[PDB]
């Protein structure tokens, strides 16, 4: 049912409400040749009344990315605002929504994967229940309403206990399975908010992969709206 899909999804969304802000210390691991390269970054996130999340990622290490920064303001309706800061020339570039499907800094995450999940961005459909990694899960489909998406659909395995994604399969514009995102090392914050400390995107067609690992997560650190102003990019 389309209406069970929507009900599940509204609950998934409702169970992740109220966290306010967070600062994550992170590692990005790119396995994008025959072998591996590692980046260090911080991700600041802010929950916004009546909108999508804002996120500011700043890369710290190694030298070829130090200072590079990515700012995202997710919108529920219409295009996200996205900007990339490159410190070499101190130029902020707006990322056009027509280009959201493109890869973010050579990784298996697209620009569009770095906005927050919002119910208004998809049409939902419950497919079936399944057992996955020994957890009871809902399997549901979400179809991006935006024609600029690189995806025809995503299929989400969502655990019944906590309504967390365990796996998301992404299908490309031609309908073919493109890549899978897995979530592991979930940890709960303020007795409510689940965050996956290990996330792995594997491209099946390519098969490059990108891991996102979190070593530390602080919530409600005092961040505010002006800390995500595009003018902050230049420091
Ligand atoms: Mg079912």
UniProtKB/TrEMBL annotation:
<dbReference type="InterPro" id="IPR029046">
    <property type="entry name" value="LolA/LolB/LppX"/>
</dbReference>
<protein>
    <submittedName>
        <fullName>Hyopothetical protein</fullName>
    </submittedName>
</protein>
<feature type="domain" description="Uncharacterized protein TP-0789">
    <location>
        <begin position="53"/>
        <end position="235"/>
    </location>
</feature>
<keyword id="KW-0732">Signal</keyword>
<dbReference type="Pfam" id="PF17131">
    <property type="entry name" value="LolA_like"/>
</dbReference>
<feature type="binding site">
    <location>
        <position position="126"/>
    </location>
    <ligand>
        <name>Mg(2+)</name>
    </ligand>
</feature>
<keyword id="KW-0653">Protein transport</keyword>
<dbReference type="GO" id="GO:0046872">
    <property type="term" value="F:metal ion binding"/>
</dbReference>
<keyword id="KW-0813">Transport</keyword>
<dbReference type="InterPro" id="IPR052944">
    <property type="entry name" value="Sporulation_related"/>
</dbReference>
<comment type="subunit">
    <text>Monomer.</text>
</comment>
<keyword id="KW-0479">Metal-binding</keyword>
<dbReference type="GO" id="GO:0015031">
    <property type="term" value="P:protein transport"/>
</dbReference>
<dbReference type="InterPro" id="IPR033399">
    <property type="entry name" value="TP_0789-like"/>
</dbReference>
<feature type="binding site">
    <location>
        <position position="129"/>
    </location>
    <ligand>
        <name>Mg(2+)</name>
    </ligand>
</feature>
């Amino acid at each position: 049912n389309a209406e069970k899909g929507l009900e599940i999804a509204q609950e998934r969304k409702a169970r992740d409400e109220g966290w306010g802000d967070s600062i994550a210390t992170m590692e990005m691991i790119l396995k994008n040749a025959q072998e591996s390269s590692t980046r260090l970054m911080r991700l600041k996130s802010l929950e916004v009344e009546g909108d999508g999340d804002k996120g500011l990622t700043i890369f710290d290490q190694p030298r070829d990315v130090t200072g590079t920064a990515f700012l995202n303001h997710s919108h529920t309706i219409g295009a996200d605002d996205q900007w990339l800061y490159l410190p070499a020339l101190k130029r902020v570039k707006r990322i056009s929504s027509r280009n959201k499907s493109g890869p973010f800094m050579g990784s298996e995450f697209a620009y569009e994967d770095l906005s927050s999940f919002e119910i208004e961005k998809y049409r939902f459909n419950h497919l079936k229940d399944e057992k996955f990694n020994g957890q009871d899960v809902f399997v549901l489909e979400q179809i991006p309403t935006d024609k600029n998406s690189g995806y025809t659909k995503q299929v989400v395995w969502l655990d019944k206990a906590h309504y967390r994604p365990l796996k998301v399969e992404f299908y490309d514009r031609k309908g073919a399975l493109l890549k899978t995102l897995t979530f592991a090392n979930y940890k709960q914050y303020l007795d409510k908010y689940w965050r996956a400390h290990t996330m792995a995107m594997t491209n099946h067609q390519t098969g490059k992969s990108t891991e996102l690992n979190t070593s530390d997560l602080r919530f409600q650190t005092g961040l505010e709206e002006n800390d995500f102003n595009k003018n902050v990019l230049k420091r």
